[PDB]
Design a protein around this ligand. Structure first.
Ligand SMILES: Cc1cc2nc3c(=O)[nH]c(=O)nc-3n(C[C@H](O)[C@H](O)[C@H](O)COP(=O)(O)O)c2cc1C
Ligand SMILES: Cc1cc2nc3c(=O)[nH]c(=O)nc-3n(C[C@H](O)[C@H](O)[C@H](O)COP(=O)(O)O)c2cc1C
Ligand SMILES: [Zn+2]
Ligand SMILES: [Zn+2]
Ligand SMILES: [Zn+2]
Lengths: 398, 398
């Protein structure tokens, strides 16, 4: 209901989605819901940056009328189209027909494909362009593939305010809006879960756009993403985190995701971790069929090692392990070392599948044919897994 | 607690697992638990067929002492070594060290591998071989790869009793023991869920073994499998069923499994469905992220068509779909036609992975490059899917 002011004239007018437990379809789990943020700037000429997820258009409009009775809206910025952000696009245009749309090219094309039948004045914007609203203007910065092709940021220099959309956001539902009103530790963890699951494969593009904003000495006093809390107090903190995560130097940490039918593969898992811990390396042990794939990925962003295990069923992998694997192949973990392991009763087959997938994800296998075992692990075997983890530990060194 | 007599001198001494929900580890889901059946034959020389999942050894032993306290046990037959069956091997072997183990060769090897530190007077068995216990005797039938290499059935001619272990079994926990004491419809569906998820890839060996028993003209009056109910009143129906499923003639049915992020792919799934129903086909629609892969696989057993859709994320398939794909490749569905489909926003990529996996599962694509959409379905797009479902409907004809 109640809109929130970032500063005199600039307001937060999005909606909070408290009960959503899954975003991007069944992909990103939102244990704590999320929010669709939209920003209104009231000047001689008023602008609305991004909209809201369709099912929440009511709350948007309501918050809008909460600032000014008949909604003016001279400009309508669209940094992204996705849906969670442009779903209310139609509702809004019908509300303010003559509103002027400013966006990237691919954004315009996308906007035309996901809606059409919707007439509107536009004006393709490019990185560096600039429109004025009076006392305040709004320059832009193209942000291709920083999630999507049509992606871009919106910078209001007059207040050193940045509106990067999806980037720098976190999927959290809260009645509070700013980072100084949330636990510093918990909010950053969410920020990491978002990065790990969305921006992981675009790390290099990220370091780039980052340095770019630095070369231009853009004064970023506050960052207001399209999901979650608005970084008002310490915005340098996530800028720096992103910087760190994007480089991916990592920490002497190792994630072991796996699953088993009769425990043989599990034992191999303990042995690997026991050796890894001995090498002075932290370890996260995830039994896939009872762990959040999304949380497992978040843990990997930081780890310098990834070990996946599974026995073999019908000459193939254990289905439960498939999701993690293909999700890794698409996310492409920047600079990582890993291993594959598991048991079998006669022929095997999981090990090849695992190693091909792992290699496809660009994970440097610390020992090509990984530790496989027939039926049950033997002492010599567990010892082998032990030293192997011991070996990985030493490489992740730190 | 109490044992149940199948007939004078022959008792059910297994254990019922009411709370289990995931058998074979995270693989097969048992919405209604299961049982680990074990049978005791009291003749001039009492014998035990299989044991029980370790965690229920006390129950087994407890039940044995209830037939004859000082536990005799001249022979101990290991029809299968899996674990849900041989877990209490060491326990029963300690109870009676002097026991004569009867098993296959591969069984023996597995047994010596899974246990060792346990010696026992054995004697490899082969098809036809026969051991006498007095009035009653017991002949064995090797059943290689009928689930596992060491698999085999135990036949008691005097009673026309067949102890096939896993084959003909269903994962279901009931206080009652025989088929005539259970809903024919519900029990046969479980029997199918079992076959569909475990024996599906051995259909050919199934018909052959069934025929072999047909030649030998074995008199099967009752079938007591290792899991579930005991076919006492009508073994014919389950044998007919297995024979049918094994052939794989199928039914003019089609299973469409998929998942999406923003619906486009869902819409395609629908289009295809309509065209199929129009073609006079029965359809089952499954949004993978909300369905049981095991329940889905059960449905495919009868189906003559398998369609799998998915959008494309990070140039790969949506992780949620991975499981089905990999479970199918391993399961190798006999005589099935299929089609892959889905949307993309710019590059695409899930279609190749889909057709790749689908082919690898030995599924005949009705149209190599399957239907694909960019962003949102258009009129012709859906019409196209319609026609395609219409085409598959035509081929599955019946
Ligand atoms: C349904 C089922 C199917 C199996 N298929 C294969 C197979 O194709 N090839 C193989 O080498 N082992 C197969 N096995 C044996 C397992 O790979 C072996 O028991 C292993 O020790 C299990 O590892 P775990 O205890 O970590 O689950 C199969 C086991 C089960 C229960
Ligand atoms: C996290 C995310 C990642 C994506 N990655 C790709 C990609 O690599 N290639 C592509 O062509 N489209 C990509 N898309 C776009 C979707 O394929 C496209 O929006 C499609 O219309 C969604 O299908 P659906 O409505 O069935 O969920 C991506 C979308 C999201 C939200
Ligand atoms: Zn709200
Ligand atoms: Zn009891
Ligand atoms: Zn319809």
């Amino acid at each position: 209901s109640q809109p929130v002011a970032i500063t005199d004239g600039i307001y937060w007018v999005g909606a909070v989605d408290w009960n959503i437990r899954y975003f991007h379809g069944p992909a990103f789990s939102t244990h704590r819901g999320t929010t669709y943020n939209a920003y209104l700037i009231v000047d001689d000429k008023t602008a609305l940056v991004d909209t809201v997820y369709e099912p929440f258009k009511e709350e948007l409009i309501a918050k809008l009328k909460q600032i000014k009775d008949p909604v003016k809206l001279d400009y309508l910025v669209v940094n992204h189209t996705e849906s969670d952000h442009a779903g209310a696009f139609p509702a809004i245009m019908e509300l303010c027909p003559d509103a002027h749309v400013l966006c990237t090219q691919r954004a315009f094309d996308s906007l035309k494909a996901h809606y059409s039948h919707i007439d509107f004045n536009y004006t393709i914007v490019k990185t560096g362009t600039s429109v004025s609203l009076g006392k305040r203007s709004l320059t832009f910065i193209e942000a291709p593939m920083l999630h999507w092709p049509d992606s871009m940021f919106t910078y209001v220099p007059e207040e050193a305010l940045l509106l990067p959309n999806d980037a720098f956001g976190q999927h959290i539902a809260t009645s509070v809006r700013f980072d100084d009103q949330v636990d510093a530790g918990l909010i950053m963890d969410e920020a990491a879960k978002y990065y790990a699951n969305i921006l992981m494969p675009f790390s290099n593009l990220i370091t780039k756009k980052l340095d770019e904003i630095q070369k231009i000495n853009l004064a970023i006093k506050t960052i207001a993403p399209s999901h979650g809390i608005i970084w008002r107090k310490d915005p340098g903190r996530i800028i720096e985190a992103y910087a760190r995560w994007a480089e991916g130097q990592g920490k002497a940490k190792a994630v072991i995701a796996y699953d088993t039918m009769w425990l043989s593969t599990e034992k191999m898992a303990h042995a690997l971790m026991d050796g890894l811990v001995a090498g002075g390396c932290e370890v996260k042990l995830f039994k896939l069929s009872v762990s959040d794939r999304n949380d497992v990925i978040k843990e990997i962003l930081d780890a310098r090692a990834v070990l996946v295990g599974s026995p073999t069923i019908n000459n193939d992998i254990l289905p439960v392990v498939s999701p993690l694997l293909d999700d890794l192949v698409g996310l492409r973990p920047k600079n990582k070392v890993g291993l594959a392991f598991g048991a079998y009763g006669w022929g095997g087959g999981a090990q090849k599948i695992l190693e091909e997938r792992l290699k496809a994800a660009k994970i440097e296998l610390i020992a090509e044919p990984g530790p496989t075992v027939q039926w049950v692990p033997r002492g010599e075997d567990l010892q082998r897994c032990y030293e192997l983890g011991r070996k990985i530990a030493a490489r992740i060194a730190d």
